[PDB]
Structure 1
Amino acid sequence: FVVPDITTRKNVGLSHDANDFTLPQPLDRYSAEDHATWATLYQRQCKLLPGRACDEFLEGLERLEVDADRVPDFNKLNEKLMAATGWKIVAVPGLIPDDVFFEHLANRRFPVTWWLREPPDVFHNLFGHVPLLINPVFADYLEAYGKGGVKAKALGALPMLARLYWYTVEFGLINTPAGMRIYGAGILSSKSESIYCLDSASPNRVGFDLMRIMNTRYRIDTFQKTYFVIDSFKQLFDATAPDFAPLYLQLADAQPWGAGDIAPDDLVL
């Protein structure tokens, strides 16, 4: 049997723009159970993340006044985000087409799935992804990433950018004098990957390298086998400076690294 998935079920009776896929945040659809689920997830992550999340992340939660006890009102959050870096969040139904996603980031809009899991949802997207948007260097990286979507689409290279996004914005680590810390949203919203990625001898921790990353496969249904480590958000922004077109064409011919591979030139940590 095939039953409707959570995206389908949650969006019953709702609409979205056929071109940009946004909708007003449907506040009336959040039940008491939704707010309680949010509060439980927020409490869980805030207990586990000190000394694991990068300090900027935890500061962003506070500066944006991300609600601890209910699903946040996007408009209220936007008042703080806009004043900090000129970014805003927009509600979307769930996963959206790549060219739409890139167009949003290129215009300093961060798409956030509106609905919550039952006890890539609103907790993952808002709690995991949004706090670092108050950091001007990280925000500029996302904008530059977005702006690259047009060229990538024209060259059939969106999956090569998707690898960069996955291994930075979703699953990135940042080294600090106090020890390795986490900035990837997929880790920051996770119950246990937050532990494994810092504490386990199992995964590879490899120094950030743009070409290497864009040549690296990833898998979505398991903890990462490789994490890429930056020294600064400036390293991410600076990585977007050159022309990606000849990088894409070089990679198009190559065999990608597997998700668990170590490459000959890796700086291994």
Structure 2
Amino acid sequence: PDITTRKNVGLSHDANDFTLPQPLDRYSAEDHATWATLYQRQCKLLPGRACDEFLEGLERLEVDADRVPDFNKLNEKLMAATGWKIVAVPGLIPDDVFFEHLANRRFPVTWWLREPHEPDVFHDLFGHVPLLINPVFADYLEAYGKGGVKAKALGALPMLARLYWYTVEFGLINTPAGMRIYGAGILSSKSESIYCLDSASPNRVGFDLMRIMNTRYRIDTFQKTYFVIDSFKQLFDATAPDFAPLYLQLADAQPWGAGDIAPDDLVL
């Protein structure tokens, strides 16, 4: 039995949107201490690494440093800033429900936390949610959600997911102060936060819609390529055109491997 099944023994979910109210009972003191340790460790590590918008979202959303946050209390601030809410889910959900959530400004957050010794509540909430404070990033995510139906209609969801992976989960952003991180999967990771900026090993490549959507990724370890945007506005702009011809042109195409450099990459 996996972590999700194990964590969810005895609980339920809405039949339509796979949400539940956050099971606030069921958090044990060990959950709060684990949350606090993880939060603490990231907060000491992230200055001069996370983009400023991330660190600032933690503050403005008052993401508890010493316990798993109350989703509702967080939603009060999140709704007021950008019209988004978080919804508690049991873990991985059907993609149809996920896109529909994002299209509706609901951000699905796994309710449970890893054990001290899968996306969990730390990755989903610490990693993803602080950035929903940035209106352009907030709109990009909504646009992404809506983009689900066209990609589904075209059998191109894997191409859309690569885009999401390489921006929302593992995106880097170039600033006048140097490279910073906006990808949630990095930001909730001690070692990957270090690696993605410090190491000479991974490829660091200028964002390019078509290349990203034709690029495989790594699910069990650090990424081998990171894609770098100039701003949230550039990212929103570049992802505003009709994706339909892009999806069709890549239909019979062979994808770049997670570690490839493409002939026309802007490499760093």
TM-score, reference length from structure 2: 0.98
- Once the two structures are TM-superposed, the CA of residue 16 in structure 1 deviates from its matched residue by 1.0
- Provide the secondary structure at the position in 1 that maps to 2:10: coil
Partner of 2:149: 150
Hey, what's the Cα distance between the residues in 1 that align with 2:46 and 2:111? 24
- Once the two structures are TM-superposed, the CA of residue 235 in structure 1 deviates from its matched residue by 1.4
Hey, what's the Cα distance between the residues in 1 that align with 2:238 and 2:92? 26
- Once the two structures are TM-superposed, the CA of residue 240 in structure 1 deviates from its matched residue by 2.2
For each residue in 1:119-173, what CA deviation from the matched residue of structure 2 results, as whole angstroms up to 9, or x when unmatched? 0000000000000001000000000000010111111110000000000000000
Identity level (%): 100
- Once the two structures are TM-superposed, the CA of residue 236 in structure 1 deviates from its matched residue by 1.4
Hey, what's the Cα distance between the residues in 1 that align with 2:254 and 2:200? 27
Q: What's the C-alpha RMSD, in Å, of the aligned pairs?
A: 0.6
Moved more, 232-241 or 93-102: 232-241
Hey, what's the Cα distance between the residues in 1 that align with 2:4 and 2:221? 21
Partner of 2:108: 111
Partner of 1:206: 205
Alignment of 1:82-101 (within 5 A): 82-101=79-98
Hey, what's the Cα distance between the residues in 2 that align with 1:30 and 1:127? 17
- Give the gaps of 5 or more residues in structure 2: none
- Give the gaps of 5 or more residues in structure 1: none
Hey, what's the Cα distance between the residues in 2 that align with 1:129 and 1:217? 22
Q: How many residues align?
A: 266
Structure 1 runs, 4 residues or longer, greater than 6 Å off: none
For each residue in 1:71-128, what CA deviation from the matched residue of structure 2 results, as whole angstroms up to 9, or x when unmatched? 0000000000000000000000000011110000000000000000000000000000
Hey, what's the Cα distance between the residues in 2 that align with 1:160 and 1:219? 15
- Provide the secondary structure at the position in 2 that maps to 1:52: coil
- Provide the secondary structure at the position in 2 that maps to 1:146: helix
- Once the two structures are TM-superposed, the CA of residue 19 in structure 1 deviates from its matched residue by 2.5
Hey, what's the Cα distance between the residues in 2 that align with 1:33 and 1:150? 40
- Once the two structures are TM-superposed, the CA of residue 17 in structure 1 deviates from its matched residue by 1.8
For each residue in 1:47-79, what CA deviation from the matched residue of structure 2 results, as whole angstroms up to 9, or x when unmatched? 100000000000000000000000000000000
Hey, what's the Cα distance between the residues in 2 that align with 1:72 and 1:102? 24
Q: What is the aligned counterpart of 1:52 among 26, 41, 49?
A: 49
- Once the two structures are TM-superposed, the CA of residue 222 in structure 1 deviates from its matched residue by 1.3
